[PDB]
Every structure is written in C-alpha cells, then in structure tokens.
C-alpha cells in the first residue's frame, strides 16, 4: 500500500523513514530506500554489501571512510579487495600487518617506496632488512645520521662499508677534535679489518648462500615458500 | 639493545629479552622476534590475540603447519573467504658468515 505512496515521497522523507526502517531492523530494506552518502555509508557498514559499499564509496573521498571501512572489510575477511582499498588508502600500518603475516616482497617494494615516505627512521630499516638489503639499510642511515649504528651493521653483515663509513664518522668526530675523538684504523693497527680475518664475508659459504637465497629451506610447509633461520642456519653458516 | 643483538649475528639474548617483553604484553611487537629467526613461539600467544585462525594460517603453513590454523578455523564456523597478494616473498637474510665479523665487542684506539 505504502509502495504506492513511495513514489510520493522523495529526498529527505526517505531518510527519516529510513531511520525508522532501520529501527524496524529492516536493514536491507532500509538499504533499498537508502538515501544519503553518509546514510548509505553507515548503513553499509552495518549491511556489508561489500562491493556495493564500494560503489557507494565510489571514489570514497575520505581515507577516513577507508579507515573505517578497512576495519570492516578485514572483519569480513574480504582482503583482496581490502588490500585494494587499504592500498588505495595506502594506509600502511594495518595493511602491513596482513602483508607481513603471509609475507611479501612486492608489498615491500611499493612499501619501500612508502618506507621512504614515513619520516621516522626506524620502520624503514626493518623493511630494508626484511627485504634483505643491507644496502638499503645503510643508505637510509646516511640520511638520518645514524652513524655509530650504521657502522655496526656495516661491520656485522659486512658490506665493508665499515671502512668507508668509519672514515666519515670519524670525520665527524674529527670535526670535534681530540685524538681520542678522531680515532683511527682499518686493515691494521687499531683495527686489523681484513687482517683480523673473522665473520662477515667471503666466497664459499657465500656461494652456498647464493643459492640458498634462492631456495626454500624446507622442513614441511605450503605454497607460501620456506627459508627457516635458526640452529641449522648457524651451523651451515659457519661451515 | 635487542637491535644491537640482532645486528651482531648471534641468537639468544634477543630471545630471552623477547620472552621478557612478550611476557610484558604486546599487540604489535612480536614481529621483532620473528624475522631474523625462522621459527617463533610467539605464534602460540599470537593466535590468542588474533585467534581468527587467519593469522595462524598465514604464519602457520610453512613449518608444515597451516593445518592447526585450519582446525580451529573450521570449529569456529570459518570466516575467511578472500586474501590479498602476500605469499612469502621478501628476504630475511644477512649477518655474518666467516671472515669480516659481527661485533660483539668493538676495538678502536685513541690514535
């Protein structure tokens, strides 16, 4: 009966009543009438026509929508898309949590790009590492003035930037003269670098490694490939 | 300090520390223990924070252990239905094979 009336209601009317309908709990039906982007939106949150919600979003026109929505999407476990929205949002933090949990390089490159974006030094490093990229970690340091720290990495996992880098750090120190403050040596004397001969470089292990990076470590797994990184690793690594 | 420990090419100290801060709660931090590692135990805890078998699967599958994550997931009345890219594809690799150190201890000189 009402439907005959329905033509003979418009804009705003629909809204009020929609709220009534919503009160009725005739959410779907409430959806059908739906009439305000906001109105549609909130209801949409309740409702979850997911795709449908997207169309309403269309171009959302507010990350806040995406943020709100992201939580919702994620709940529905409509991730493929969620990723698209979140990505669309480029809302890195939550998105990272998923991306990381299954794992992914690709995410990492784009993200790397992002990593560059973020404005505090630290996250970006994990990324660089995570990717496996000393190089990236070290380059990053150059901008931030992480210098003592950069040396440790450069030493540990040797890109022998310890030599290069140390000179520069030392130079800062140098600026701030005093001989102790200057501090000096790479192959020999103070440090014996390559003459010490101990644990962050060489070819053979490295060759084995070269491959290693390429295969999946294995134990028993899924399509989501292996790498391990534990006891075993220590042993071969020494070899 | 943990960072120093992972920088260096050795494994325990971070792990006790990991215990002792895991043990001091967490929602975003477990991550620290996992990467340089393969294996994590965090997952036992983690699932409890999540507990949607989702995290548990994503994480799970490779030790050849996707499976328990599914068992619960089913029990619940599952809710997963779509996923995004993420297939383990970034390198947790680097650190210190023989010749050209670590640095537990770092020598220098005033000279």
Numbering used by the authors:
A (entry chain C): 605 to 843
B (entry chain A): 703 to 813
Which statements did the authors publish about this structure?
The linkage structures are at lower resolution than that of the leaf, so we fitted our leaf structure as a rigid body to assess which subunits are close to one another in the linkages. Consistent with our previously published structures the central contacts in linkages I and IV are made by the αε-COP subunits, and those in linkage II are made by the δ-COP MHD. Interestingly neither ε-COP nor the δ-COP MHD are essential for COPI function and the combined deletion of both is not lethal for yeast. While the contacts formed by these proteins at the linkages may play a regulatory role, they are therefore not essential for COPI function. We found that βArf1 is close to the N-terminal β-propeller of β’-COP in a neighbouring triad, and approaches the trunk domain of β-COP. While the low-resolution of the linkage structures precludes more detailed interpretation, the proximity of the peripheral βArf1 molecule to neighbouring triads suggests that βArf1 could modulate inter-triad interactions.
Coat protein 1 (COPI) coated vesicles function in retrograde trafficking between the Golgi apparatus and the Endoplasmic Reticulum (ER), and between the Golgi cisternae in both retrograde and anterograde directions. Coatomer (the COPI complex) is a heteroheptameric protein complex, consisting of α, β, β’, γ, δ, ε and ζ subunits. Arf1-GTP recruits the protein complex coatomer from the cytoplasm and anchors it at the membrane. Polymerization of coatomer at the membrane assembles the COPI coat, which recruits cargo molecules and membrane machinery to the assembly site.
